[PDB]
Ligand binder design. Sequence first.
Ligand code: SF4
Ligand code: SF4
Lengths: 887, 887
Amino acid sequence: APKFKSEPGERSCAYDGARVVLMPITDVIHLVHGPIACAGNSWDNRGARSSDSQLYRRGFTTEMLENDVVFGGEKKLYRAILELAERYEGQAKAMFVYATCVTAMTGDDVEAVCAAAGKKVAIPLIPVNTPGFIGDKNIGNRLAGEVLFKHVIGTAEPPVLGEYPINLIGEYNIAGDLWGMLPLFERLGIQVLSCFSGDATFEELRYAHRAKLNIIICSKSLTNLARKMQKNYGMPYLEESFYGMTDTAKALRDIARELDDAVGGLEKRIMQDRVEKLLEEEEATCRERLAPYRARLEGKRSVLFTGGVKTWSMVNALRELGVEILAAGTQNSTLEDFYRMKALMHQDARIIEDTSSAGLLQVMYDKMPDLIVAGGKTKFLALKTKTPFLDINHGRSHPYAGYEGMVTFAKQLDLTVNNPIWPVLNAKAPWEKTEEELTAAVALAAGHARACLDEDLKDSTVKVPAKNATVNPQKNSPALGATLAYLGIDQMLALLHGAQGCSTFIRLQLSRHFKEPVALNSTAMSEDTAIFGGWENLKKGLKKVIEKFSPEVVGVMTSGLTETMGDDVRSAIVHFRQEYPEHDGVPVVWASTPDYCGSLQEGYAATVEAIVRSVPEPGETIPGQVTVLPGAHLTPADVEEVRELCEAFGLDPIIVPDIANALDGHIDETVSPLSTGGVSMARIRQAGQSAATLFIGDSLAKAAEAMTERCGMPSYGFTSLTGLAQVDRFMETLAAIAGRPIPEKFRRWRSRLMDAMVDSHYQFGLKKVTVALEGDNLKTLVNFLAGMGCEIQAAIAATRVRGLDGLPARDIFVGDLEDLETAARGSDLIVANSNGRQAAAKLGIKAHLRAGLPVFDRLGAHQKMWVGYRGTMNLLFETANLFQANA
Amino acid sequence: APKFKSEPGERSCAYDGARVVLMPITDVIHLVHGPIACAGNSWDNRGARSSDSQLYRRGFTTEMLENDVVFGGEKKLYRAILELAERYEGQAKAMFVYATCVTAMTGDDVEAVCAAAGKKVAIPLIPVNTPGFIGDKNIGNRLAGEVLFKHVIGTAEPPVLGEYPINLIGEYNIAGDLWGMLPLFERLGIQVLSCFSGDATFEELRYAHRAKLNIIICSKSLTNLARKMQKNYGMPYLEESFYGMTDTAKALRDIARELDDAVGGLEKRIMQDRVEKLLEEEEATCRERLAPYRARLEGKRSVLFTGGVKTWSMVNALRELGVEILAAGTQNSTLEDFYRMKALMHQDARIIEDTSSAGLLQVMYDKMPDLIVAGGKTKFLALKTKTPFLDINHGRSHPYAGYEGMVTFAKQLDLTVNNPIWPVLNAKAPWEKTEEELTAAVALAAGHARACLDEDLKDSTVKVPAKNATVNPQKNSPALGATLAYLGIDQMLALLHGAQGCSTFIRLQLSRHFKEPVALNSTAMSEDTAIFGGWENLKKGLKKVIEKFSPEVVGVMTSGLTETMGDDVRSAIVHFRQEYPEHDGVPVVWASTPDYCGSLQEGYAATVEAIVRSVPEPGETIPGQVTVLPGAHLTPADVEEVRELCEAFGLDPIIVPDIANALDGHIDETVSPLSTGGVSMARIRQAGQSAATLFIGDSLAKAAEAMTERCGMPSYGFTSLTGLAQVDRFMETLAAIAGRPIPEKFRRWRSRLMDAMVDSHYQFGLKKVTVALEGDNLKTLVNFLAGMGCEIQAAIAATRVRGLDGLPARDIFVGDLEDLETAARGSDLIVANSNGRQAAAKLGIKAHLRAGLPVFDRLGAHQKMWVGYRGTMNLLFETANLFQANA
Ligand code: SF4
Ligand code: SF4
């Protein structure tokens, strides 16, 4: 129950009321006479929007200082008025001066200085004298209404006077609220002569005495203004609200009755007939539109802490949406509104009385509601409880009044309630779930390898591409992936058994992506060498490269033509080994990466498998050692923090190949032609004695099998390391392997990730997002985005991989970037490589997320970090920032 | 010396030559008949730009597959031609089909399929039959010229035939190169009848047989075309280049002579007179423009590895810029061009012959040049040596030919050579500099506190603000900083002795910035309490808050009015302690934060000083413990990694206040009204026994003094922790305190930061950037941006602080955001808080960097991480990405 004095240790100052009633006026200068704390940290905070000069959104302050406090601040206000009038001529029609606590203490007379400066300026000055300490926000509202009636109403006559004029009193146009009801008011004939304190011109506001009916939306702020206008002008008021459908229907019907009283009689029911016609048509359409949302929003519990008239109206609206109220409490409302809400408040719903944070926490922990529709104060206090929240206040950024506003309200309610993140957040944490679920998750991770391998390519509802001319191919050569994995080995250069031209566009692409040199030497093959036998060139190139650069190991990969005429690299390898025994000490790893076999991902997987099957040998079972085979999707930073996470549990990680140290970008003391930085051959040889194997890519599964049978280690697989659900499984596997509990830093990062998820899920709801990436880095991004609310319009894959059908999206198919812009229609986010920028230019989608390879137009792509809890937080924040910027 | 066969173990395939001569044609379809590696990783890579349909930038591939290789690929090409003609009707006038190595091996006849499909389409088909293996890029260039002459030249007549027509042969319009010479050619009367293979329409290209003079820029690619056109049409050629001023002058003079020969006689010197007039005027203007750059670019050494005609021309241009050549080697050039360059090559300059990476490294280590102007291959090979580099190739993104192009060339040369990052990068690293410099740097850090404190505010050339009406104030209440520092203490809520309205807009601002709840309770003071004595309310509020929330410590901060009437909080504190001895166990910290005293920074510093002077007590000198007083500018992530860096050296860090754990955003198991997460009172009490004190803010210096005399610990200060120069000093201080060498991870991160600096300095050169931030976070950003090349147009400070004059910028002053948009004119980057977004909307500056407080429109601001080597890398990458996006 409202109890309008106060006890020390909630209601703001009277300046807050003055600004909440006067700031929404657009083309005026709101000069605040006082120190910083009054206007320094409060300007541009009001949720009022406008389609006008937008002069109100900028804040004006006199900047009360040291000397002028003990001398006087009237002269500073004089200069401020004069300068603001002179400089902002043509953009300001009036200006409001607000008295503050310090101004009142100093004895500054706002009225006197305003009268003194009035004669010297052509812009009217309104002396709002509302010191902050004189009361709560209600005193400020009343004083603002007083000054509005005294100095604004009754000064100019309207140029056009519609035969049915009404005044909107108490509506402040928060996030387009006014623009939802305005299309209804002029459609049926009424003219909004003056909408008070919202999207309102000052001259437009001075027309309010020539109307015939007043509509009071917020009773709390401007009821005294309505009463005084009734007393002085014979203007009947009407207390209604526009939040809902039945409430708006009743409001419009009452408006029609009171309009038909004042102009003509109730007989010749001119207004009522059109009001009923519009009501019937628009209500039928709105119900048809709202039906799909109610089914998903039926039976959910609700608790509301809303101050003003919304408390009465929203309870109706929620009740017609298909939800019931468990608790309802208001701090900022009239006693009549409280009693009316209590009348609406059904039994078994208890009215809150403690409006403080402690009382709110009590009622939230007691009622245990699903959704809480409350104010800005209880905004983050309810998110910490991990329950859906909807904000209906100045900070709200959506229109909720009117029929279209009600549709938007239901959309936002479904956005915040049915988000797929709430069950994940409410799930039991790794540090407290009992041991049987830990073993089940560990066994699931262990068997993920065979689950991925067993899935057949034939039974796949995603379609085999059947395009002849593909334009803008997002695929890359598998030789690119072979070179990528070869660069991850310390002191080694890659020998491309190709045609000397494939060396270009492979070295060049990697150089433009990672911004680092690539060696990538090639054995030149001309037309003469293509005919007869092509394995002379392999021996010649091996001899030349060993005699020139002296590598300790050589990686040989095949190109398209070398598979077209089908020379076996291994026979040339054994021949070269036999002819020159002096080169026995330098091993060679050969991997078949034909160009019809797929894209960078398969090439990477195949060369990793070739490395695994050849170099390491089975020995002892030294515990505390784990072997990680990173996928092609992980950037060097991801591999570096995979190493960091492995070291956190005390385990010794061996990463094969080590992209994190070679292609990350490092200025060593001396530049060498070979690729240095990766894992040495001793480490890759001793990696076969590890106690466990982890692979962070689906395509790596086969490689894991290649080490399961050769040495005997158990394998563990994770298709992604993002989304707080896969990172948890990674933590479980790491804890099981190491045998020690998760460190505290990971618990802290999980808490931070939860806080990021709760504070950012509003921008990830029902956003149409398209993704066009490789076989991997597409599952990760799709599962992360679809796991946060966004529905994937199209998940376009570079090549066919196992488990593509399980992705949550409308359609999955394999296609180029042409499929991307022919399928990204009506989408706001594109997740594709940099080369897809053209598609954005064709569709006007300004939100492009650079993922995968290649990314050349954005620097730091190789350092892009999206692994673990911290990487998940970084990706979430980047995507949320893109959503905020593009809209 | 060029040596046009090749040895296995550089020249690309013939398809690269075909594309380098044919791809720059804009409105054609470049269908590549082959597997992925030919066009999958090469499309949209050519540097040719256009002002036309831009159909060339998208790549077309037939996608040779498994079965069709062993069956046949002609039918796939047939379908591809048909589909591309049907779908892209209206955007394509012609289309080129390229034969690849796999296509040639399979025996596919491009000519036969093109002839078969010609009758069924209205778009001409050009069968470019250049298999990759048949030779190097030169064979591809010759074959492309052959097919251009055979199938393009001599098919249609020009609609308009200027009396002086010329053909531009061998110019490909790399980054607006053509658009620098085009304004000169039509100004003096000549008509460019056909510019070959650059910004050229196909129909426009078929007009080339009706000209009278040929200009050959690149002799290597299209000299055979010029010779054949001379043989078949009587068209004299002219081998010149347009890189330079004297070279362009000679080219234009020769053009005038050869034009006056063919149309009329040399007598009536119509062309020569206007050519000489334009040459004189434009050369005088260009020399006047170029003079300022030569002074900064005089005497610098240079080494060039450029392939084509640029080798001859740029040597001239560089020589006229004021630099000399130490070594010059070309791989892709004619023997005549090589001999001509050698003739230009002065003595003591030795021509390189080994064009491989090893030879380039040899010559770079031997000559030791300052600047290297070389190709895309040697791009990152020369950046690792830490020497300035300028790219003149397809990857170059600037026009360098013509007079305006030469001005741009000098601008880019000065950008890459005189960057202030090269001396920093070449400076000796922390792990190798000897001990006297280590001691000097440590002593400088120790004395930084007194250096900052000793600087007087009176001797400061930055100006005392003298504005009456300040609009859009970027300042915040010092009570905001007091609350910020109070939130960093575990299990404590802040009591605001104010007027119950300042509680709003302080709690609300922090809540909108950090997206976390703020307790911030206030002792309500009305008009009656303002008169008489206001210290009854302090006792009442303290009693209420202690009896309700039961805190273990209470932070009391004063507001503006409480200083206007001047009640002493401490007398009320002692009175409250006396009246209720039961509350003895709960200490209270009081800090005077009046609202005329400054902004958030000073409030934070003052409350930190109040906490330091009261809670801790001097005890033992337990080694290995360090005390860190973070500044108000550091976000929670910065404090968290300050802790991480301190723990890396084995030191135990005590952070006061601990923002990194309270306001970072964490979903704890239970929501409490008090602010939890910070440092406990036991830790803050035992922090007085540390072996060293570190402060990361200038304003914190006084606080450090407050702990220097109370306990006796030496102090160390760092005004910033970004830029690789201050992080180094931080590492030196940490190593000196701990007594152990820097770990390897920091060395790796320093190498990565160096690589980021070398690869991103091109976007930070001569970029006009404006900064409007607090006293701190402005020195850091200004020193980082000015330390990377950008010149600061205006460094606008929220309030006057010590050492403001030393910032590198044109003008420093204290002002609001109005000063920001009145001073950010002609700037491309704005570094200000989120509330300055309006200024961007007024100036069209789309690159806005959200720094400082408040930042509400971008999520994750509190997690924004700009500390240490990794934070410096993150900030560098974010700023570079903004520069790339906004331009
Ligand atoms: S296959 Fe032939 S044409 Fe294609 S990239 Fe390799 S060398 Fe060049
Ligand atoms: S000084 Fe007075 S008017 Fe200003 S914010 Fe505080 S209570 Fe409100």
